[PDB]
Ligand binder design. Sequence first.
Ligand SMILES: *[C@@H]1O[C@H](CO)[C@@H](O[C@@H]2O[C@H](CO)[C@@H](O)[C@H](O)[C@H]2NC(C)=O)[C@H](O)[C@H]1NC(C)=O
Lengths: 22, 49
Amino acid sequence: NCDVVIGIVNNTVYDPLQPELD
Amino acid sequence: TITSGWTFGAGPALQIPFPMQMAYRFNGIGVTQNVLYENQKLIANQFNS
Ligand SMILES: *[C@@H]1O[C@H](CO)[C@@H](O[C@@H]2O[C@H](CO)[C@@H](O)[C@H](O)[C@H]2NC(C)=O)[C@H](O)[C@H]1NC(C)=O
């Protein structure tokens, strides 16, 4: 989960399947 | 070394945060890099002793 690493930033991770599939 | 790792021996010195330097070094020995990032405090405290 993103609450133990120090320095995490918030950003969008793009999944190529989701748009085309849907 | 503490600021640029091993890059200054092959060219220009390239800065990178030290915590990230240590994570690459674990990767070079076949350990996945999250082992450091999730345990950064433990490794730093154990090293210091
Ligand atoms: C990264 O995103 C998470 C999720 O949106 C942020 O967590 C929220 O932070 C605000 C305060 O900034 C809290 O009021 C919310 O309760 C948090 N949400 C959860 C689910 O905990 C997080 O702060 C963001 N990080 C940065 C640096 O903006």
